[PDB]
Amino acid sequence: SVIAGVFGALPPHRYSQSEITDSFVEFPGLKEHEEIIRRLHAAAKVNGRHLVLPLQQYPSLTDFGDANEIFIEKAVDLGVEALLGALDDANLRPSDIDMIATATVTGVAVPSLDARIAGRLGLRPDVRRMPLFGLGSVAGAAGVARLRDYLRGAPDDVAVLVSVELCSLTYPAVKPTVSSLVGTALFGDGAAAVVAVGDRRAEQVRAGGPDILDSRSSLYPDSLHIMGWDVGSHGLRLRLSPDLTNLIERYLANDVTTFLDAHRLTKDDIGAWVSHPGGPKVIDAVATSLALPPEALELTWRSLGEIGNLSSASILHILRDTIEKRPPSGSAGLMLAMGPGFCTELVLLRWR
Amino acid sequence: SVIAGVFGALPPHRYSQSEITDSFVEFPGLKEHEEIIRRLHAAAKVNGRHLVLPLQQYPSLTDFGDANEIFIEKAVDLGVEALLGALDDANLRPSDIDMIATATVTGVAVPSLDARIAGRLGLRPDVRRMPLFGLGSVAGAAGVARLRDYLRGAPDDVAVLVSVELCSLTYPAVKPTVSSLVGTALFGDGAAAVVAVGDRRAEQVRAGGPDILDSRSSLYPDSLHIMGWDVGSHGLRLRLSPDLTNLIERYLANDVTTFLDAHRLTKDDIGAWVSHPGGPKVIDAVATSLALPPEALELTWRSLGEIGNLSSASILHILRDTIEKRPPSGSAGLMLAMGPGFCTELVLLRWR
Ligand SMILES: CC(C)(COP(=O)(O)OP(=O)(O)OC[C@H]1O[C@@H](n2cnc3c(N)ncnc32)[C@H](O)[C@@H]1OP(=O)(O)O)[C@@H](O)C(=O)NCCC(=O)NCCS
Ligand SMILES: CCCCCCCCCCCCCCCC(=O)O
Ligand SMILES: CCCCCCCCCCCCCCCC(=O)O
C-alpha cells in the first residue's frame, strides 16, 4: 500500500487562543472559574484554533441533540472537502475508490458519515464502508494502518480514510471540571483525508506519497479510565486522567522497540517522526521516553501551536506537513498515536 | 477466509411476546395506546425475546446516561460470552485472534467494546481492533464481509467479529409515536460472535464453517432517511420509514442478480439463504422480489419468532442455525442483510 494523497481541511472561522479564552471566561457559568481557565488555556501551547461555529454562538449550545445535528451536517461538509483535496492530490476521482473508512469521536452519525460522504460524492454504490468510532485520537494512525491491511488483500484497489473531528460541538457536555477545562484549552475543529492505492495500483496511478509497510497496536492492561466519553443527557463528556503522561513515560519506549526490532531498525533509523500532539505534557513525555532531539518533533509542535489538537485529524495534517518538507528519500518514518483504550498505534513508513 | 466458529449469547430472562405486551401496556404513559400496541405486537411474528433487564424495570429506565452505562456493563458481558463460545467451537484461544471487529448500533462505548472485550479475555496487546458504529442492521453481513477482506491479505491469520445489540436499553428515547412503537414490537437483546481464519490456517485448525468467497455492498442513493437514529438528550430515537419495504421490492433483485452473475450463478444455485429478519413484511418483500419458495427463508422466520429482531446479531443467529441444519456439502449460501444507508450487503458462502 502506497499513499497517493494527503489533505486537511479546517473551518473558515479562526480565532487566536486568547480571543477564544477572553470570550470563554465570559460564558454562562465560567466566571467563578476564570483563573484556572486562563492558566490552562495559556500552558496549552495552542496559538489559534478553527471553530465550525462563530465563537459568539457557543454559549447557546447547551442542547446535545442540536449539537449533534449540527455535527452531522458540518462534519460531512468538511469530510467532503478534504477527500476532494486528497483525490486531487492523488490525481484521482471518487468513481475510483473501492473502500472508504471514516473516523470520528465527536459525534454520533446513523447512517455513519461514510454513508453520507459517499452519497455526497457519488461514490460507486458497491463501495466497502468502514465507519470506525470509538477509537479517538489514535484513529489517524489506526486508519492508515486499517487501509494498509485492506490494500494487502486488494492490490489493485483504492482506499480512502476520512477523519472528521468537531471538538467544539461537544460543548453541551463541558463543565468547569479540570479535565473538561483541559480539553477546552487544547481542542479545535478540522478534517483530514488520506488516499492510498495497493501495491499493483501504485505505478499506474503514479502514487506520490509514502509507502505504508507495517503498524503495531499496543493496548494497555486496565487503563480504560485513561481516555473516554462519559455519555449522557449532556452529550459526550471528557474523561481525561493525569495518569496519561506517566503511562507514556513508562511504556512507550518499549512499544517502539518491539515494533522496530521486527524490522531490525533503531530509533536512529527514523528519518521523520509523525506524532500526535496530545498537548504540551504528552509531546514532552513522548520526546523524553524515546529521547528524541528537539527537531524530530518540531512539526508536531508547530501543528499544535497553529491549529490546536484536532483529535484524530491532527496526525494527518502533520503527516501532510512532513510529506511537503520532503524528507530524505527512501528513509523511514514513524507515525505514533494514542487514544481511548488506552492504546498506542505505530505506523511504519518509507518516503520517496 | 473460512469460518471456524459461530455462537450466539443471550440474556438469561426470555419473555413471551404476550407477557411483554400485557406489561408494556401498563408502562408509565402507555395505556392510552394499548390498542395500537397490541396490534403491532401481535402483527410482528415474534413469539418471545430475551431482555437484558427484568421487564418490570423498563419504566424506570428514563435516563440515557443510566441506559448507556447499563449498556456498556452488559454488552461487554454478553460480547465476551458470544466470543469465547465461538472460539471453543473453532477450538481456538483468545490469544490466537490477530484482529477483532466489533459491532453495535445500540450504545456509545468509548473506549470501544472491542477494546473492553480484548481486555476481558486477554487478547494480545497488539490485536488489531476494528470498531464499527452505524451500519446497524447490515452489520452482521457487513462484518463477515470485512473479515474476509482482512483475511485475504493475511492467510495465516485469525479474525473475529463480535456483534452485540441491546435494543431494550434505548427505552429512554421511546415515546408512543408510530415508528417508535413498531420498534417496541420487534427488537430484542443478544450477541453473536464469528471466528474466521484465513486460507492457509484453514488447513491447520481444520476450519469447519463455510468458506467466505465474496461480498457486495449496495448503498441506495438519497435514502439516508429510511432508517437510523435521531440522536439527542433523550438518547437513540429510532427513525424508520414506512417506505423501506417498497425499496426492497423495487431494488433488491437487481442487487442479487448483479452479484451472482459476476459469479456465474443463479437465485437457484443457492444452497441456503441467510437473511436478516427485519420484519415479517421485510422477509415477505425479500422473498417476494427474489421469487423464492416459503422454505427458502424458514430459519429467518423462526429466528424472528424465537428471539425477536436482534439488529446485526440476528443473521449470525440464523447463520449458526443454518450450519446446524448442514446444507448440502460444496453448495453455495448467501448472506443478505439491510440497514441504515440505506444499503444491502451480500455475502457469498460455500458450505462444507
Ligand atoms: C408493524 C409490523 C409489525 C406490521 O404491522 P401491521 O400492523 O400488520 O400493518 P402496517 O405495517 O400497515 O402498520 C400499521 C400502520 O402503521 C403504519 N406504520 C407501520 N410501520 C410504520 C413505520 N415504521 N413508521 C410509521 N408508520 C408505520 C402503517 O403505515 C399503518 O398505518 P395506517 O394504518 O395509518 O396507514 C411490522 O412488521 C412492520 O411493518 N415493520 C417494518 C419492518 C422494518 O422496518 N424493519 C426493521 C429493521 S431491522
Ligand atoms: C471548545 C470545545 C472543546 C472542549 C471540549 C473538549 C472536547 C474534545 C474532547 C475529546 C477529544 C477527542 C479525543 C479524546 C479522547 C476521547 O474522548 O475519545
Ligand atoms: C420492553 C421492551 C422494549 C424494546 C425496545 C423498543 C425500542 C427498540 C429500538 C430498536 C432500535 C433498533 C435499532 C437497530 C437496527 C438498525 O438501526 O439498523
Report the alpha-carbon distance of residue A113 to residue B231 in Å, rounded: 14
Q: For B29-127, where are the E strands, in sequence order?
A: 48-50, 99-104
B162 shares a domain with B47: yes
Ligand 1 center to B46 CA (angstroms): 14
| Partner-chain residue, chosen from B224, B233, B341, that has the shortest CB–CB distance to A63 | B233
Are the CB atoms for B147 and B194 separated by under 8 Å? yes
CA pseudo-torsion sign A313, A315, A321, A324: negative
Does B111 contact A134 at a Cβ distance shorter than 8 Å? yes
CA angle B282, B286, B291 (to 5 degrees): 145
Query: How many domains does chain A divide into?
Result: 2
**3-state DSSP call for residue A291?**
coil
Does B130 contact A131 at a Cβ distance shorter than 8 Å? no
Burial class (CB in 10 A: 0-12, 13-18, 19+), A124: middle
A4 shares a domain with A108: yes
Q: Which of B86, B66, B84 is nearest to B74 (CA)?
A: B66
Residues of B in contact with A341 (CB under 8 A): 111, 115
Q: Please state, in angstroms and as integers, the Cα–Cα distance from residue A273 to each residue in A76, A267, A290, A328, A349, following that order.
A: 30, 10, 11, 13, 10
Torsion region of B330: left, alpha or beta (phi above 0 gives left; psi -120 to 50 gives alpha):
left
Residues of A in contact with B126 (CB under 8 A): 216-219
Start-end of H helices in chain A: 17-24, 34-42, 64-89, 113-121, 139-152, 178-186, 201-204, 243-261, 280-289, 298-307, 314-325
Solved with: X-ray
Residues of B in contact with A224 (CB under 8 A): 111, 115-116, 119
Give how far A150 is from chain B: nearest CA, Å: 6
Other C-beta atoms lying within 10 Å of the C-beta of residue A105: 30
Bridge partner list, A164:
A191
Q: Which of A244, A339, A301, A65 is nearest to B64 (CA)?
A: A65
Report the alpha-carbon distance of residue B309 to residue B139 in Å, rounded: 13
| Partner-chain residue, chosen from B63, B108, B132, that has the shortest CB–CB distance to A131 | B132
What chain A residue is nearest to B172 in terms of C-alpha separation? A233
Report the alpha-carbon distance of residue A4 to residue B152 in Å, rounded: 22
Give how far A226 is from chain B: nearest CA, Å: 9
Instruction: State which H helix or E strand residue B118 sits in.
Output: helix B113-120
A34 shares a domain with A109: yes
Please tell me if residue A146 touches chain B, with a CB cutoff of 8 Å.
yes
CATH number, domain of B321, equals 3.40.47.10
**3-state DSSP call for residue B52?**
coil
Which of B207, B239, B266 is a domain's end point?
B207
Residues of B in contact with A130 (CB under 8 A): 130, 132, 146
Bridge partner list, A9:
A191
Q: Which cell is B276 given? A: 436478516
Q: Which of A241, A229, A310, A308 is nearest to A64 (CA)?
A: A229
Torsion region of A159: left, alpha or beta (phi above 0 gives left; psi -120 to 50 gives alpha):
beta
Does A340 contact B112 at a Cβ distance shorter than 8 Å? yes
Ligand 3 center to A104 CA (angstroms): 24
Which of A172, A207, A242 is a domain's end point?
A207
Length of chain A: 352
Instruction: Find out whether the beta carbon of A170 lies less than 6 Å from any atom of ligand 2.
Output: yes
Report the alpha-carbon distance of residue A283 to residue A288 in Å, rounded: 9
Report the alpha-carbon distance of residue A202 to residue A3 in Å, rounded: 9
Report the alpha-carbon distance of residue B74 to residue B53 in Å, rounded: 9
Q: Which of B301, B255, B247 is nearest to B278 (CA)?
A: B301
Question: For residue B340, which ligand has an atom nearest its CA?
Answer: 3
Instruction: State which H helix or E strand residue B89 sits in.
Output: helix B64-90
Give how far B42 is from chain A: nearest CA, Å: 28
Amino acid at A186: L
Please tell me if residue B215 touches chain A, with a CB cutoff of 8 Å.
yes
How many Å from the N-terminal Cα to the C-terminal Cα in chain B?
A: 13
Does B131 contact A126 at a Cβ distance shorter than 8 Å? no
Q: Please state, in angstroms and as integers, the Cα–Cα distance from residue B43 to each residue in A35, B40, B186, B300, following that order.
A: 61, 5, 10, 16
Residues 6+ apart with CB under 8 A from A105: A133, A134, A135, A136, A137, A139, A165, A229, A236, A311, A312, A339, A340, B110
Report the alpha-carbon distance of residue A46 to residue A14 in Å, rounded: 12
A161 shares a domain with A172: yes
Amino acid at A304: L
SS3 helix, strand, coil % of chain A, rounded to 5?
A: 45, 25, 30
Report the alpha-carbon distance of residue A189 to residue A114 in Å, rounded: 18
Instruction: Find out whether the beta carbon of A21 lies less than 6 Å from any atom of ligand 2.
Output: no
Question: For residue B135, which ligand has an atom nearest its CA?
Answer: 3
Q: Which of A40, A63, A65 is nearest to A182 (CA)?
A: A40
CA angle B50, B55, B59 (to 5 degrees): 135
Ligand 2 center to A170 CA (angstroms): 7
Of all protein residues, whose CA lies closest to atom 45 belonging to ligand 1? B278
Give how far B107 is from chain A: nearest CA, Å: 9
CA angle A129, A133, A136 (to 5 degrees): 135
Are the CB atoms for A335 and A299 separated by under 8 Å? no
Residues 6+ apart with CB under 8 A from B219: A115, A118, A119, A123, A125, A126, A127, A129, B341, B342, B343
Size of interface A-B (CB pairs under 8 A): 183
Other C-beta atoms lying within 10 Å of the C-beta of residue B226: 23
**3-state DSSP call for residue B72?**
helix
Residues of B in contact with A142 (CB under 8 A): 129
Q: Which cell is A321 given? A: 506537513
Q: Which cell is B29 given? A: 404513559
Work out whether strand A211-219 and strand A343-350 pair parallel, antiparallel, or are unpaired.
antiparallel
Does A231 contact B150 at a Cβ distance shorter than 8 Å? no
Please identify among residues 323-352 of chain A the ones whose CB lies closer than 8 Å to any CB of chain B: 340-343
Give how far A215 is from chain B: nearest CA, Å: 10
B159 shares a domain with B196: yes
Amino acid at B211: D
A46 shares a domain with A24: yes
CA pseudo-torsion sign A112, A116, A117, A122: positive
B129 shares a domain with B44: yes
Report the alpha-carbon distance of residue A170 to residue A67 in Å, rounded: 7
Please tell me if residue A312 touches chain B, with a CB cutoff of 8 Å.
no
Other C-beta atoms lying within 10 Å of the C-beta of residue A15: 17
φ, ψ of residue A200 in degrees (nearest 5): -50, -40
Q: What is the resolution of this structure in A?
A: 2.2
Q: Which cell is A325 given? A: 518538507
Q: Which of B39, B335, B326, B88 is nearest to B216 (CA)?
A: B335
Ligand 2 center to B252 CA (angstroms): 41
A285 shares a domain with A342: yes
* Per-residue DSSP letter, A210: -
| Partner-chain residue, chosen from A115, A222, A236, that has the shortest CB–CB distance to B219 | A115
Report the alpha-carbon distance of residue B20 to residue B296 in Å, rounded: 30
Report the alpha-carbon distance of residue A79 to residue B141 in Å, rounded: 26
Residues with CB under 6 A from ligand 3: B 20, 24, 58, 105, 136-137, 167-168, 170-171, 174, 183-184, 187, 227, 238, 311, 339-340
B224 shares a domain with B150: no
Tell the residue number behind the cell numbers 411474528, with chain if given. Answer: B45
Are the CB atoms for B88 and B94 separated by under 8 Å? no
Q: Which of A279, A258, A243, A220 is nearest to A346 (CA)?
A: A258
For residues A281-301, one letter each, b for 16 or more C-beta atoms within 10 angstroms of the residue's C-beta and e for the rest, the string is: bbbebbbebbeeeeebbebbb
Q: Which of B29, B319, B25, B54 is nearest to B189 (CA)?
A: B54
Report the alpha-carbon distance of residue B244 to residue B135 in Å, rounded: 16
What is the extent of the structural domain holding A136? 1-207
Give how far B148 is from chain A: nearest CA, Å: 9
Does B129 contact A222 at a Cβ distance shorter than 8 Å? no
Work out whether strand B99-104 and strand B128-133 pair parallel, antiparallel, or are unpaired.
parallel
**3-state DSSP call for residue A341?**
coil
Give how far B154 is from chain A: nearest CA, Å: 8
Residues 6+ apart with CB under 8 A from B127: A217, A219, B97, B98, B99, B100, B118
Ligand 1 center to B233 CA (angstroms): 26
B320 shares a domain with B275: yes
Work out whether strand B2-9 and strand A13-16 pair parallel, antiparallel, or are unpaired.
unpaired
Query: Which of A25, A137, A244 should be mutated for ligand 2, with most atoms under 8 A from CB?
Result: A137
Q: Which atom of ligand 2 is nearest to the CA of A227?
A: 15
Query: Which of B184, B234, B239, B312 should be mutated for ligand 3, with most atoms under 8 A from CB?
Result: B184
Length of chain B: 352
Are the CB atoms for A307 and A188 separated by under 8 Å? yes
Other C-beta atoms lying within 10 Å of the C-beta of residue B192: 33
For residues A21-42, one letter each, b for 16 or more C-beta atoms within 10 angstroms of the residue's C-beta and e for the rest, the string is: beebeebeebeeeeeebbebbe
B202 shares a domain with B214: no
Residues with CB under 6 A from ligand 1: B 39-40, 43-44, 137, 178-179, 182, 185-186, 240, 242, 244, 278-282, 309
Which of B145, B180, B207 is a domain's end point?
B207
Bridge partner list, B348:
B214, B334
Q: Which cell is B56 given? A: 418490570
Report the alpha-carbon distance of residue A318 to residue A163 in Å, rounded: 14
Work out whether strand B158-166 and strand B99-104 pair parallel, antiparallel, or are unpaired.
parallel
Residues 6+ apart with CB under 8 A from A274: A299, A300, A315, A318, A319, A322, A333, A334, A335, A336, A347, A349
| Partner-chain residue, chosen from B136, B228, B232, that has the shortest CB–CB distance to A68 | B232
Ligand 2 center to A183 CA (angstroms): 6
Q: Which cell is A113 given? A: 458519515
Residues 6+ apart with CB under 8 A from A162: A79, A82, A83, A100, A101, A102, A103, A113, A114, A117, A191, A192, A193
Residues 6+ apart with CB under 8 A from B271: B327, B328, B331, B332, B333, B351
A52 shares a domain with A66: yes
